[PDB]
Design a protein around this nucleic acid. Structure first.
Ligand SMILES: [Mg+2]
Ligand SMILES: [Mg+2]
Ligand SMILES: [Mg+2]
Ligand SMILES: [Mg+2]
Ligand SMILES: [Mg+2]
Ligand SMILES: [Mg+2]
Ligand SMILES: [Mg+2]
Ligand SMILES: [Mg+2]
Ligand SMILES: [Mg+2]
Ligand SMILES: [Mg+2]
Ligand SMILES: [Mg+2]
Ligand SMILES: [Mg+2]
Ligand SMILES: [Mg+2]
Ligand SMILES: [Mg+2]
Ligand SMILES: [Mg+2]
Ligand SMILES: [Mg+2]
Ligand SMILES: [Mg+2]
Ligand SMILES: [Mg+2]
Ligand SMILES: [Mg+2]
Ligand SMILES: [Mg+2]
Ligand SMILES: [Mg+2]
Ligand SMILES: [Zn+2]
Lengths: 131, 104, 138, 156, 208
RNA sequence: GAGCAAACCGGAUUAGAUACCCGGGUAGUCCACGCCCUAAACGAUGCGCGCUAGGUCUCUGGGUCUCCUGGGGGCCGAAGCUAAC
RNA sequence: GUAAACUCCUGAACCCGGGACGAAACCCCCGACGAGGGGACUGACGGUACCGGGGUAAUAGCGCCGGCCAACUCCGUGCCAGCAGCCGCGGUAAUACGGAGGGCGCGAGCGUUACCCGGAUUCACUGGGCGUAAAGGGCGUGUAGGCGGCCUGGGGCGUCCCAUGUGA
């Protein structure tokens, strides 16, 4: 375009679209589980994947994937949502953090941990170094 | 020092008052192309001496109403409808953009 | 009717050289004539000389090239490998003195047009002035 | 005299063609050979076996070299070169700057024996034409512009 | 707490001999002696042509691991450099080599850097008179780096200087084994240093 | 309002045909004035201007006229361009 | 993996004693009520920092190791349980799931999530485009506006330069 075009009717800056409708910015959410179903995957993969609606503090009723090999969430549990989409589950775009509120970290895990909230073990259960 | 600006009257409808057009000119903050914008200032004619299209100079002064804060020092050419005709012709356009709908 | 008198010349020299013509003619005028004074003192072109054609003044710019080369495509390297217009009309590009360009790391000039004649990045800087940046040649 | 340098494989690919029955891969190696003293050359030959592919390109390499005008440890001056859609652009840099560029242009510049550059990229970041991309750059650097503008011209 | 733990495995990972222990890493036992291959369950297997990043990386962990500094203190100096007039490269080293905990190594007061790090900590060293238990203290041109008066009587230290009787010092330092003192003549220049490094690469690593 | 022809009426083909085929047939296609304004409204390539090899065919004016000079339409092609075409 | 064991050297913590800068004047005296000089009270932080002596080896974790992105085998599991930033990995040999060993990274921290800039020449002024990829307005007429051939002379608004004030 002519520079005397760029002048009248300039350049439109690029607006962003939050892929995380969790009001007022906010990094985590507080929601009350509602229905803890088991959605299937998508085109390429397959199985059963734990997921669960969550009436969010902000007011949104959003779906959330339930990470881990097994979890203890029910129909009234209070949970913390993180953020990050799964690629085999349309509609959900948020994760459930563990070891936070009615949300408990999966047992026996041993590498993830920080991810998957799960106080590491005691290993022989002694001071910071014996066994 | 009080700023002086040089423009072209464009309306003498009011009493002891004259609407002057100041065209300025500057390069783009972000495109450097030269550019022209304009402003209508309202200065006082205590002698009714200045008439349509006279090219005047202007100075800051005691506000003399809502908007008028300048005066008409002295002349710079006692006649040029050439430019007034432009402004008058710009307005004439608006009178016709949107609403009226020449299509109805 | 030309729109940018200079740009015309510059180009007329540009294509001219790409086909290796011996010299090209361009509408005369002080300015262009002063602008070619540089390309000439600087070696991009053997030279120009006021000439007439059909009755209208024109300038014959005798282009300068290099030697024929070895291997395929034997055409001679270019003296004016690049010659652009910077300060176009409706785009006036004036630069301060501290804003003068460096151009092709000194391999090329940049004809300025300071209120002190038509100089080059060098001179203009040397004299201590800036002004409309007419072009950049290398 | 001597005709031996240091070789570096830029990027290899299987290419696959198709026929009744199935597919048929043809390999592609992209090599750069250099002195680190001013000479370097790209090369990309194909073959039914990577090695030959490399070797071949090793031969195509050494055949297309370009004495690069290095001043100290850099390119004498600036240059940006258009290719397919790639636009490599190198900028001479002070000493102690480092190479500073893409896998490809670096593979090339680093054999031409450079040490300090800053590179400009802006399209088809395609290992291949950026390869070539960095070379005509190196082919367009100037030696004697200083001479061409002021020397006579007899027999052209 | 920078590293602290197995060292020679570091020596074995960079593939080059690193002097992180002073003694020993000289007699047949620095591991790089009949076992120069990296540690782990695959140190002996074959290595694959490294990535431009791998080289730049390895070359850094080298420069750094030689001085045993946290990538943190490491970086920030890199920056200091970057900013100072002069060849990023050497200017970097200069400083690196200006660390008290280090200078105490070059002057001999201790068998190697780590030990020197410590001596500085336990207050067995001095700079201009006022002791300094700070490893990262930058020694400036003209600062005497002596041994703590109340330390000049430690066996370990005497042992060290005792064997320096003869060992010349970098042309950028000088010491007085008698008064167990020693000055920092001037920032050692890249040449003066015999590092198996290619700082033209460390540099390149922080250009990513 | 001759011919043609959405819709629609029958005929036939089909596993079924509210379709291809066949025989009719209305709006319509036609003209007047008024309205609609869309389009593969395509060269799918805004307008103007200056510059850069040729050859070949062709329409139209000038020409010392099967040759050169102007305007318009096609073809092939220098340099150059293009992701390629 | 010299990693530990073991040996020797040093000795953060902790204990003893000492412990201050930040404070000098306002007041009072001499002097003249000046200038100057003399005198005296004045700590929250603290009994803290800091100095001197004695002094014990005396917290480590966390992320990753298919490609980008540095780090690999085995065992389990079998399109399940589960990984996932993109590409994807798992349907009975998985370097891509889980544990083990090992390894890379960083270290009182390391991962994560969110948001801003970067990469993004992906709004392009520097630095892009529109025959077929997204992109020429169906055409014209013409308004505001943007742009404007050649020569000389006045202004010198733009533009450039010097000084100076401002730019706490
Ligand atoms: Mg929330
Ligand atoms: Mg734990
Ligand atoms: Mg313990
Ligand atoms: Mg204006
Ligand atoms: Mg008023
Ligand atoms: Mg391009
Ligand atoms: Mg680049
Ligand atoms: Mg440490
Ligand atoms: Mg490493
Ligand atoms: Mg040591
Ligand atoms: Mg009928
Ligand atoms: Mg299209
Ligand atoms: Mg004629
Ligand atoms: Mg024609
Ligand atoms: Mg063609
Ligand atoms: Mg061609
Ligand atoms: Mg003791
Ligand atoms: Mg941008
Ligand atoms: Mg684009
Ligand atoms: Mg003009
Ligand atoms: Mg002026
Ligand atoms: Zn070792």
């Amino acid at each position: 375009p002519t520079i005397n075009q760029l002048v009248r009717k300039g350049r439109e800056k690029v607006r962003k679209k939050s892929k995380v409708p969790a009001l007022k910015g906010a990094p985590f959410r507080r929601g009350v589980c509602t229905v803890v179903r088991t959605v299937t995957p998508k085109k390429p993969n397959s199985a059963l994947r734990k997921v669960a609606k969550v009436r969010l503090t902000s007011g949104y009723e959003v779906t959330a994937y339930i990470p881990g090999e097994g979890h203890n969430l029910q129909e009234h549990s209070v949970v913390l949502i993180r953020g990050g989409r799964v690629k085999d589950l349309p509609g959900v775009r948020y994760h459930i953090v563990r070891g936070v509120y009615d949300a408990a970290g999966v047992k026996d895990r041993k590498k993830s941990r920080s991810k998957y909230g799960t106080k590491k073990p005691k290993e022989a259960a002694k001071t910071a170094a014996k066994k | 020092p009080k700023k002086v600006l040089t423009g072209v009257v464009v309306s003498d409808k009011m009493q002891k008052t004259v609407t002057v057009l100041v065209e300025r000119q500057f390069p783009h903050p972000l495109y450097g192309k030269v550019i022209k914008r304009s402003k209508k200032y309202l200065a006082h004619d205590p002698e009714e001496r200045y008439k349509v299209g006279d090219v005047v100079e202007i100075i800051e002064a005691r506000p003399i109403s809502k908007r008028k804060r300048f005066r008409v020092l002295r002349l710079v050419e006692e006649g040029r409808l050439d430019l007034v005709e432009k402004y008058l012709v710009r307005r004439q356009n608006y009178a016709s953009l949107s609403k009226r709908g020449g299509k109805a | 009717m030309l729109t940018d008198p200079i740009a015309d010349m510059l180009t007329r020299i540009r294509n001219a050289t790409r086909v290796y013509k011996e010299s090209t003619e361009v509408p005369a005028s002080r300015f262009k004539e002063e602008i070619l004074k540089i390309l000439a003192r600087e070696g991009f072109i053997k030279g120009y000389e006021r000439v007439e054609v059909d009755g209208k003044p024109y300038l014959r710019i005798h282009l300068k090239y290099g030697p024929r080369r070895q291997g395929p495509d034997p055409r001679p390297e270019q003296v004016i490998k690049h010659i652009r217009r910077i300060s176009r009309p409706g785009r006036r590009v004036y630069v301060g003195v501290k804003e003068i360009p460096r151009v092709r790391r000194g391999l090329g000039i940049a004809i300025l047009s300071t209120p002190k004649g038509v100089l080059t990045d060098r001179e203009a800087r040397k004299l201590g002035v800036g002004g409309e940046l007419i072009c950049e040649v290398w | 005299p001597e005709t031996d340098f240091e070789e570096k494989m830029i990027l290899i690919r299987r290419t696959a063609r198709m026929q009744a029955g199935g597919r048929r891969f043809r390999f592609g190696a992209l090599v750069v050979v250099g002195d680190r003293q001013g000479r370097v050359g790209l090369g990309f030959g194909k073959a039914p076996e990577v090695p030959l592919a490399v070797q071949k390109a090793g031969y195509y390499a050494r055949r297309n070299m370009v004495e690069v005008p290095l001043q100290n440890g850099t390119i004498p001056h600036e240059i940006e070169v258009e290719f397919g859609a790639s636009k490599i652009v190198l900028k001479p840099a002070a000493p102690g700057t480092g190479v500073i560029a893409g896998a490809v242009p670096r593979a090339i510049l680093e054999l031409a024996g450079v040490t300090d550059i800053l590179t400009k990229e802006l399209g088809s970041r395609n290992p291949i034409n950026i390869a070539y991309a960095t070379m005509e750059a190196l082919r367009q650097l100037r030696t004697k512009a200083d001479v061409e503008r002021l020397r006579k011209g007899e027999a052209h | 707490g920078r590293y602290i733990g197995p060292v020679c495995r570091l020596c074995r990972r960079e593939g080059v001999k690193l002097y992180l222990k002073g003694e020993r890493c000289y007699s047949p036992k620095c591991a790089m002696e009949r076992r120069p291959y990296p540690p782990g369950q695959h140190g002996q297997k074959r290595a694959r042509r490294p990535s431009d990043y791998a080289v730049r990386l390895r070359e850094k962990q080298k420069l750094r691991r030689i001085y045993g500094i946290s990538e943190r203190q490491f970086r920030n100096l890199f920056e200091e450099a970057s900013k100072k007039k002069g060849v990023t490269g050497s200017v970097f080293l200069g400083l690196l080599e200006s660390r008290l905990d280090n200078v105490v190594y070059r002057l001999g007061f201790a068998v190697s850097r780590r030990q020197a790090r410590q001596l500085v900590r336990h207050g067995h060293i001095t700079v201009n008179g006022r002791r300094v238990d700070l490893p990262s203290y930058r020694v400036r041109p003209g600062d005497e780096i002596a041994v703590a008066e109340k330390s000049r009587n430690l066996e370990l230290i005497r042992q060290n200087l005792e064997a320096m009787k003869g060992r010349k010092v970098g042309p950028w330092l000088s010491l007085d084994v008698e008064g167990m003192k020693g000055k920092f003549l001037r920032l050692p220049d890249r040449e003066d240093l015999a590092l198996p490094v290619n700082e033209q690469l460390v540099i390149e690593f922080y250009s990513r």
